[PDB]
Structure formats: structure tokens, C-alpha cells
Structure 1
Amino acid sequence: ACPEDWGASSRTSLCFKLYAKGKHEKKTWFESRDFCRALGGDLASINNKEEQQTIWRLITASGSYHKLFWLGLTYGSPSEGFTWSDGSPVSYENWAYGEPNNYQNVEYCGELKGDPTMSWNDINCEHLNNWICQI
């Protein structure tokens, strides 16, 4: 069962929470990771299409589309490439077309574009974004 406002009460329920913020309250990737971890969770990992649908439905309910959200995607060592901050393997992927492209060699964190495609993009970790936590 999820905490109230994070999901449903069944044993199979996945718990995610959107943090959509105005520009003065958006956070860098590291700030967002630390925020979710302080609650006992982490930035959201998306391990399968079911979790993707769960998050998309939260976005539809929020009424705001096209927003960019930090996910738990962070580059590891050169041999690893992208990892999830929660330690789970990056197996399921939904990178946008041509991504990750490490544009200008400075893109080491992953964001979700909150439109129906639910696609991922690598971007500069110091950008200020909305974020999604999991617990």
C-alpha cells in the first residue's frame, strides 16, 4: 500500500508523487535527489511500461502538460552509461529519438518530457526542473 496521495492501497501499487514547481522552487538534479531521499525515497525510476502509465496518469490528472521532470537517471562510469539513482538496473528504456546524445558533452542527468510520448532526454544536471519522487 502507498502513503496517501502517492498511490493506491493494493500490494502491487507503485508509489510516485509529482513535484511541479514555479521557477523559484525548481531544483537541480542533485537537489531533487536529496529532497526525495530525505523523505526515505528517491527520484523516480521507471522500470517498465506499467510504471510509465502510472506516472502519465498522474500528469494527466495534474492538468499541466509539456513540463520537464527530473527522473533518477544519472550517468555512471563510461562503461555503465546511464544508471538509476535507486540502484535498479536500467533495462526498460524510453529515450526520445536520438537520445541520450550528450549534447556539447555536458549532459549527465535524465529528464522526462511530460507529454503522451513520456520520453527521456539527457540534459545538464544543473538545470532547474520539476521532479518526481518515489517511495
Structure 2
Amino acid sequence: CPLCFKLYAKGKHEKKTWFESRDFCRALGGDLASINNKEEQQTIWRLITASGSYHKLFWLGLTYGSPSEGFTWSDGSPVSYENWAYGEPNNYQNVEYCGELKGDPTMSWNDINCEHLNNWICQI
């Protein structure tokens, strides 16, 4: 790396929707981050403690597919490893088709509306 992840923690005015974040990472030749196992989760947690980005929320590459698949990763891979927060994904008010990371030690995931403005994490 110059499995590689990079945090994008932005000021209030420079956060992005899920689609804007996905396009940003793809313009770099990468994608929104997928977390495929415990090792990858630890790597990202170690990046958060390095930056003081505690408690912050980040887009991951989680996106709802067909009703049959449930959530998938934007980079193509299926969701095998899961770390949803308890009760999630709950599709609250039926409008939550993207996934975010709560960047605290639990490293848990939540489904949320894709037009929410968040920080994000790229993989490359």
C-alpha cells in the first residue's frame, strides 16, 4: 500500500451522499470500502484511532441489491462477513438502502438513506 483503506473525514460542509462518495472513490481507481473479514475491520479501526476520528460516521460500500440478495458491496462482492448494529438493517421508514459505519470500537453498521451526508472510506 502507498489491503489499503483511506479515511475521508470532512468538515460539515464537505460531506457527501453515498453516490457522491462512491464516485469519488471510483475516480481514484478504487471504490467505497468493503469490510470482508475481521482483519479488514481491525485495519480500519486502527486508521480511526490514528486520526482522532472517534465516534464519526462513514459511508461504506454497502448498498441494497434486489429484494432477494439484501445488501451487497459496491465493488461486486457479496456481504458474507457482517457487523450490523443490533436491530439493523431495520430499513427505518422504508427509505434506507445504503450502509454506514459507526466509527467507534464496536465498528457496527447501520442502513440509512443514501442521500444522507456522511464522511466516507475508500479502498484502493
State the secondary structure of the residue aligned to 2:58. Answer: strand
Higher helix content, 1 or 2: 2
- Give the superposition deviation at 1:89: 1.6
Number of aligned residue pairs: 124
> Which whole-Å deviations, capped at 9, do the CAs of 1:25-49 have from their partners, x for residues lacking one?
1000000000000000000000000
Which consecutive segments of 4 or more residues in structure 1 shift more than 2 A? none
**1:48-67 alignment to 2 at 5 Å?**
48-67=37-56
Shift of residue 100, structure 1, vs aligned partner: 0.2
Q: CA RMSD in A?
A: 0.5
Deviations 1:45-69 (A, max 9, x none): 0000000000000000001211000
* TM-score normalised by the chain length of structure 2: 0.99
Larger relative contact order (C-alpha < 8 A, sep ≥ 6)? 2
Percent identical across equivalent pairs? 100
Query: d(CA) in 2 for partners of 1:58 and 1:80?
Result: 30
2:70 aligned with 1:76: no
Q: Deviations over 1:51-105 (max 9, x none)?
A: 0000000000001211000000000110011000001121000000000000000
Please list every run of 5 or more consecutive structure 1 residues that lacks an aligned counterpart in the other structure: 4-13
